[PDB]
Design a protein around this ligand. Structure first.
Ligand SMILES: CCC1=C(C)/C(=C/C2=NC(=C\c3[nH]c(/C=C4\NC(=O)[C@H](C)[C@H]4CC)c(C)c3CCC(=O)O)/C(CCC(=O)O)=C2C)NC1=O
Ligand SMILES: CCC1=C(C)/C(=C/C2=NC(=C\c3[nH]c(/C=C4\NC(=O)[C@H](C)[C@H]4CC)c(C)c3CCC(=O)O)/C(CCC(=O)O)=C2C)NC1=O
Ligand SMILES: CCC1=C(C)/C(=C/C2=NC(=C\c3[nH]c(/C=C4\NC(=O)[C@H](C)[C@H]4CC)c(C)c3CCC(=O)O)/C(CCC(=O)O)=C2C)NC1=O
Ligand SMILES: CCC1=C(C)/C(=C/C2=NC(=C\c3[nH]c(/C=C4\NC(=O)[C@H](C)[C@H]4CC)c(C)c3CCC(=O)O)/C(CCC(=O)O)=C2C)NC1=O
Ligand SMILES: CCC1=C(C)/C(=C/C2=NC(=C\c3[nH]c(/C=C4\NC(=O)[C@H](C)[C@H]4CC)c(C)c3CCC(=O)O)/C(CCC(=O)O)=C2C)NC1=O
Ligand SMILES: CCC1=C(C)/C(=C/C2=NC(=C\c3[nH]c(/C=C4\NC(=O)[C@H](C)[C@H]4CC)c(C)c3CCC(=O)O)/C(CCC(=O)O)=C2C)NC1=O
Ligand SMILES: CCC1=C(C)/C(=C/C2=NC(=C\c3[nH]c(/C=C4\NC(=O)[C@H](C)[C@H]4CC)c(C)c3CCC(=O)O)/C(CCC(=O)O)=C2C)NC1=O
Ligand SMILES: CCC1=C(C)/C(=C/C2=NC(=C\c3[nH]c(/C=C4\NC(=O)[C@H](C)[C@H]4CC)c(C)c3CCC(=O)O)/C(CCC(=O)O)=C2C)NC1=O
Ligand SMILES: CCC1=C(C)/C(=C/C2=NC(=C\c3[nH]c(/C=C4\NC(=O)[C@H](C)[C@H]4CC)c(C)c3CCC(=O)O)/C(CCC(=O)O)=C2C)NC1=O
Ligand SMILES: CCC1=C(C)/C(=C\C2=NC(=C\c3[nH]c(/C=C4\NC(=O)[C@H](C)[C@H]4CC)c(C)c3CCC(=O)O)/C(CCC(=O)O)=C2C)NC1=O
Lengths: 69, 162, 50, 172, 49, 172, 162, 172, 162, 162, 172
């Protein structure tokens, strides 16, 4: 995150519509559970792989906001 | 649901590259064996009542105590929902046969099977004998490869119950 | 856990040599294995004994 | 994630009945030209890099204001992300081409692609135009019957056009 | 006990969910600095604030 | 997460003074009634599986659409989750009964449960009725004078009823 | 904050399980010990001013140079600050006694104590010996197991300082 | 995280034209006064604990409600958090001063800081007063001529005052 | 971007501590020879036209196959693109010089260079030879320390390309 | 130890790359900054015992009670080993001057300082103001360029103690 | 990690004494002549592809049985790993040249390399030969007089040769 492109991070508001809990019913809750709506803040250098992992899981995002400007 | 082609897109989207020869090949094989699966599902779609009632009477005759008073097999509504449960197993096996993937089964019955059998005191032995009887009648109704593909999803349901 | 095979060492050495320490570390924490085993809110622990 | 078979099972289950004979007939047809659609998929995947390169060339041909310094595709990492986005859009449309269902695309990143572009400030119209020119290049590649036995395959072309159209509509 | 590693299996799993007051935080920090740094001493200066 | 003693402590800190003899007498009364409180929470934990199975039977008797296809509990894992969430709310109510503070349940989960059950489209009044039936089935077990030295516990029954009422109303 | 009940609930909820016999056991022990701690904290509240005045006199006798001009303890304002700090420590000891846990003490005094004492160059030994003085006076102001619990809480505060 | 050089390069690439003569000359000047800048940031770093301690003394003296029970800095934990925030603010001010650009401060230290205090109930006016007293002490420690060679640094004092003041405004 | 001040501030903020002796020494080392860098950038910003035409013609000379029709080098718009490319590289070398670091050079040329170059079918040796000519003539247009800075930065660009 | 050279190498090492322009820039700054630092080290080493005696007597003059019977400074061993501690601090300041980095300070003194001062009740203020005396004495012991370096390291030691 | 200064410091500290006058003289001479060291390190850094390529050409033109099928550099993955190891060893030699001390080399490249190469079956004799070939190609580059002022650097040639020989003797 030394260069300028590393900063200008983004904040993602993620909803937990049942499309991921339906798979995790089969995978298993081998960690303590949390509520539905939660917000993650990701830097630009890994924004794409972050939301890609979320969608591989099956996350539904309501809105995405730019933290810097 | 995780069907064969659904497996293809799923196992593709995780990584960068497109659908290579292996995934096209798997989808190809599924596309051949789908049509026999469709006719097998049709043949299984004609005999709801016979299959369900034969399985019900088989599980009742194997377990004489559930019928007897004081046990949860006793009852009019109880037997009606016995029939509804076996119809559910039949329709979900039909869905799996149509989709050529265990997706519908894992989604609609197997997910959360243990916990609900726990809380409602159901015994998997009843349903497993029902599925064995359904295996028996698929042995006669279906022949050859269609019989094999039907039996494979069926005994997948057995493996899920056990 | 311990490494399972030599391909892990080769892959991670090449990942480091090409992308740096930060990417090398991210390959561990952002991996599906950490997320499924420990997730966002569990401290890592020696799970390789079972 | 839901394909056409999964969608049909979804309806049949939510109604509470089985699949009707019409459903089985439709799905038998789908399995019949599964071979043709997999040939379309193979053409799309193998011809994908050429589609991307030609697409980028013509896309920069229509509008140059992305290439000028400070342009939306100037920085050589932001046009790099441009190319990667075109590549992943083509891959997603191929995924829909297999699935035969619009659900797999909309569920996969099309909910928040709009908002990432809005917050980022990416011009959605340029993305959409890139989509249509990709669709044209892909269609031209799927016209070629060399090495693949001839047949009637207008349905696949229509379906791919509709896929690229929904991608553009969700983007812009 | 035949392995050395009984103390590490019997050890309870420690989790830290967002609404924590004070002391499970002070324990989770100890657990993290004990595991991640591999039971190496982390002097008070080295600990990031 | 906080108990009644620490509520007195926190308000004493806020006003900056030492704990007053009136609140101290209240805390002594609570501490001596804690013997009955422990039996109450023990009854809850002991009878939890019977209570949840009972309330599940009554709910699936009074409400039926959770059986029919398209109903929320019709898919098998979904009503597995029904039972699991009933168990969770009972566990939190036992926590609250031991603590004597309702916030340990409310502030812990009811903030997110409202929006979760709004988004999921579940009939939330059905969940409130589930809490009410949970309360009734637990009330049946808490009045079991067998196995326990007989005493006065009307206040404990009122506390449990109000805790479940607040849980349901926050759900509702 | 943190009492026996609070730690009970926390440990029970952390493992995601109901409230079984072991934590009921801890709760019952704390519940039985309640009344003596109540009386101890009541006795301490009866002696706020005497204890704090004696403690500041103790710190002055053990740290005579503090009183000289140009030091921290010069000036009546710092004298009142002596009284206020000692009163805060005593009050949080009584809070711990009532709550039957080190919780209020921890999160009100111990939480971030070293940093604050380093920022304004307060000496921990001042408060340590003042708490030893409070120990000495409660050794006579009190009686019974109330002594052992009150002295344990004072010693916990001291150990936090040291 | 930008300095004057990176920022100027950013505008130069936004234009697309090479860097001029005058701007490059003022950058060379900036380099020449870079040594006085390094001594300024050194004076800020060297005395950071003293500045924090004196600013804290003055601030807590002016607002006694912060210290008294129920105030926002009452327990040892909250006082430590206050002093740590003061030190972090001064640290980012020195970062910006050495970078010669306020970008370092605003890009990471001020983004969500404004609303975190409000959500916490922290009065941001008190934080503004804290950083103002910090600015006063930093000026006092900057005008010191001991152990360093004397010269004109009025631009440095103005720049540091601007950094402190805009940190105050952005927090408030 | 990434200038000496940028790494200094980033490393100092990483540990969450003030800038100590080492960071100030690094900033001083950057500051004291900011002047050979700026004078070198000034010397090679006046000759940019000569630089770009020389690089393009040297690329044409070294690789005869990129001149005749049937390839990308041929073409009026393509040669305008070549000149624009060389101008962009030289401008980013100037930015690297004025920054006294590789930052602007990195995040304008080097980052994402391989796949951007590859997806458009451009030989890296082309731009490598162009920058080699720029090296050759900046060896003589600049003398001493400014020459050292030039050589180093253009060669860093070359090594990135190669 | 963390110096300019070592930090450069570790930064270019963790990223898996050669040493580019910025790194050699910082290295050169270190190499030519060395000479004032080496002279400062020679002067401090030559004037070692006088500086230690001065700092010891400054500790005793500012903290007069410490030498009174019953506490820390009483008795010959504690004075001789005060001299030892000041000698250690001075030695590591010169080490950090020669290495032109805060490596030796952050390793042999600063790392683990608060714990051992806490466990032995050694007041940091004794060392802070002994270092203040040495900080002053370098004003008339050194002058010019190396004075800034020596002051910078005395300063870092004082800040770490506080 | 170490360098010459920290090595002298560590020796003096383990002994317990200030740095003597002679050792200060040695470190002062080192720092004074370190500009030639920077030129050498730059000569290694800037030409490194040339060294690696020439060494690879010679190694595989003299030892054919590596590139043969069944040879231990046969496929592209093994050849790429060969070249990557060559580059890494050259990298740590340039590091140790800048530092003036071979501790970084012996701690990051050489402390487990003979064992790794034995456990992989790679002939460590051929790896040492590759290192010596890289040494030869590099010495052709450190003696280059273009773009640098004339002078004598026999000391740096000897030092770099000893670093390459350390790598060779700790792999072979
Ligand atoms: C998604 C698909 C699905 C499955 C698989 C399913 C199993 C199932 N069967 C149930 C009832 C039942 N099911 C049975 C049938 C069994 N007991 C007898 O011994 C028979 C031999 C045997 C039939 C093979 C009985 C007796 C009950 C009565 C328990 C009650 O009162 O709910 C219940 C309780 C809720 C209800 O249906 O009213 C479940 C969850 N439910 C589903 O919605
Ligand atoms: C392993 C993955 C895979 C491959 C490699 C594949 C190629 C493929 N295409 C086939 C038939 C075919 N192939 C096409 C291809 C179309 N014809 C038009 O020219 C279009 C340009 C083109 C793209 C849609 C058609 C229309 C058929 C005939 C389908 C039918 O039997 O009715 C066949 C069977 C040949 C036969 O029945 O003797 C194969 C193996 N199919 C696959 O599933
Ligand atoms: C540990 C604290 C906690 C609670 C309380 C909680 C509630 C909760 N229940 C859920 C699923 C569910 N919950 C229910 C239960 C309701 N539906 C109706 O049938 C009944 C009246 C009622 C039973 C009480 C159902 C049916 C689902 C399935 C919805 C889906 O998977 O899409 C979900 C969605 C994801 C998941 O957790 O599986 C949440 C967040 N989650 C938590 O982490
Ligand atoms: C091992 C875990 C544990 C438990 C469970 C516990 C509770 C507990 N309950 C007790 C009696 C009691 N138990 C109860 C509660 C019952 N009385 C009925 O009227 C109510 C329906 C019912 C409420 C659920 C009452 C009221 C007493 C007598 C206390 C009194 O005088 O009010 C006693 C004293 C035995 C005696 O009085 O002879 C204990 C220790 N303590 C423990 O260490
Ligand atoms: C949670 C409860 C709590 C405590 C206990 C606490 C201790 C405390 N005492 C303080 C003042 C003080 N207190 C003292 C008293 C000491 N010096 C001598 O008189 C005595 C040996 C000794 C007391 C017996 C002094 C000298 C100060 C002024 C410190 C200064 O301004 O530098 C301050 C600084 C407040 C200010 O003036 O800005 C704190 C934080 N703070 C709290 O929020
Ligand atoms: C290695 C880290 C480093 C140090 C230790 C440092 C101190 C430093 N101060 C210098 C001169 C100076 N420094 C200042 C700034 C001071 N004068 C006024 O008293 C102001 C209050 C104050 C500003 C905070 C001035 C005015 C000069 C002389 C003008 C000039 O730099 O050419 C110089 C260059 C010439 C010399 O004094 O020998 C250095 C190296 N600079 C650094 O980069
Ligand atoms: C500031 C960041 C930046 C870089 C690095 C850059 C290089 C670059 N030059 C391009 C076009 C081109 N560049 C060349 C030049 C090459 N082919 C031959 O003529 C020459 C031998 C050789 C030059 C030495 C040509 C022919 C094209 C035509 C389109 C293509 O081949 O893709 C393209 C494709 C998109 C476009 O700009 O039109 C890039 C990315 N452009 C940038 O905006
Ligand atoms: C690596 C460098 C290093 C440092 C800095 C260091 C400090 C140090 N000082 C110590 C003891 C001590 N240090 C002092 C210092 C005091 N003496 C006078 O009275 C003054 C007021 C004041 C000095 C300014 C005293 C009194 C003790 C003995 C206290 C005790 O035994 O508990 C000890 C405990 C071990 C011992 O000496 O027996 C350490 C570790 N040790 C190290 O290895
Ligand atoms: C940004 C990184 C950086 C570089 C690249 C750099 C090179 C550099 N080399 C220099 C001199 C020199 N360079 C060399 C090295 C050459 N002469 C030998 O014969 C060989 C041909 C070859 C080395 C094997 C020598 C011997 C000197 C003169 C020695 C001296 O400065 O006293 C000088 C000082 C000017 C002078 O005194 O002539 C610099 C700045 N400095 C840097 O800070
Ligand atoms: C996982 C599937 C998915 C993708 C790929 C997506 C788009 C997307 N594009 C991004 C960057 C970008 N994407 C584009 C592309 C657009 N702008 C123009 O050039 C073109 C007309 C058009 C190309 C189709 C550009 C230019 C950027 C650079 C943003 C910047 O650096 O400021 C990013 C930020 C992550 C990163 O680049 O590291 C995302 C998430 N949204 C998704 O949900």
């Amino acid at each position: 995150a030394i260069t300028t492109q590393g900063k200008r991070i983004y904040k993602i508001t993620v909803s937990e519509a049942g499309a991921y809990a339906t798979n995790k019913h089969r995978t298993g809750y081998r960690a303590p559970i949390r509520q539905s709506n939660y917000t993650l803040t990701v830097p630009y250098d890994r924004f794409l792989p972050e939301m890609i992992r979320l969608h591989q899981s099956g996350a539904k995002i309501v809105n995405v906001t730019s933290v810097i400007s | 649901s995780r069907t064969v082609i659904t497996e293809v897109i799923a196992t593709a989207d995780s990584q960068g590259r497109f659908l290579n020869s292996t995934e096209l090949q798997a989808a190809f094989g599924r596309f051949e064996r789908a049509v026999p699966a469709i006719e097998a599902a049709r043949a299984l779609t004609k005999n709801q009542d016979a299959l369900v009632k034969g399985a019900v009477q088989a599980v009742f005759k194997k377990f004489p105590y559930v019928t007897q008073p004081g046990e949860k097999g006793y009852g009019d509504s109880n037997q009606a929902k016995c029939a509804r449960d076996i119809g559910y197993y039949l329709r979900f096996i039909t869905y799996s046969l149509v989709a050529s993937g265990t997706g519908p089964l894992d989604d609609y019955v197997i997910a959360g099977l243990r916990e609900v059998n726990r809380a409602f005191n159901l015994n998997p032995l009843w349903y497993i004998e029902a599925l064995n009887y359904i295996k028996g009648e698929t042995g006669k109704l279906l022949s050859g490869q269609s019989k094999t593909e039907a039996l494979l999803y069926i005994d997948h349901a057995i493996n899920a119950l056990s | 856990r311990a490494p399972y095979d030599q391909a892990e060492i080769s892959a991670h050495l090449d990942l480091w040599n090409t992308q740096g320490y930060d990417a090398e570390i991210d390959s561990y924490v952002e991996s599906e294995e950490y997320l499924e085993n420990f997730g966002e809110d569990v401290i890592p622990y020696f799970r390789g004994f079972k | 994630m839901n394909d056409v078979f999964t969608r049909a099972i979804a309806q049949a289950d939510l109604k509470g009945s089985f699949l009707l004979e019409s459903d089985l007939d439709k799905l038998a047809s789908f399995a019949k030209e599964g071979v043709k659609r997999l040939d379309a998929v193979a053409a799309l995947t193998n011809n994908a890099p050429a589609i991307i390169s030609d697409a980028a060339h013509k896309l920069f041909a229509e509008q140059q204001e992305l290439i000028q310094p400070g342009g939306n595709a100037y920085p050589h990492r932001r046009m790099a992300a441009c190319l990667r986005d075109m590549e992943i859009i083509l891959r997603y449309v191929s995924y829909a081409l297999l699935a035969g269902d619009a659900s797999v695309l909309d569920d996969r990143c099309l909910n928040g692609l709009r908002e990432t572009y809005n917050a980022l400030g990416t011009p959605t119209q340029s993305v959409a135009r890139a989509v249509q020119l990709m669709k044209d290049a892909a269609m031209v590649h799927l016209k070629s019957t060399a090495n693949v036995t001839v047949g009637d395959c207008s349905s696949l072309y229509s379906e791919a056009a509709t896929y690229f159209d929904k991608a553009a509509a969700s983007i812009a | 006990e035949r392995i050395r590693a009984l103390g590490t299996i019997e050890a309870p799993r420690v989790t830290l969910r967002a609404p924590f007051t004070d002391e499970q935080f002070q324990g989770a920090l100890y657990a993290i600095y004990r595991h991640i740094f591999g039971n190496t001493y982390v002097m008070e200066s080295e600990r990031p604030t």
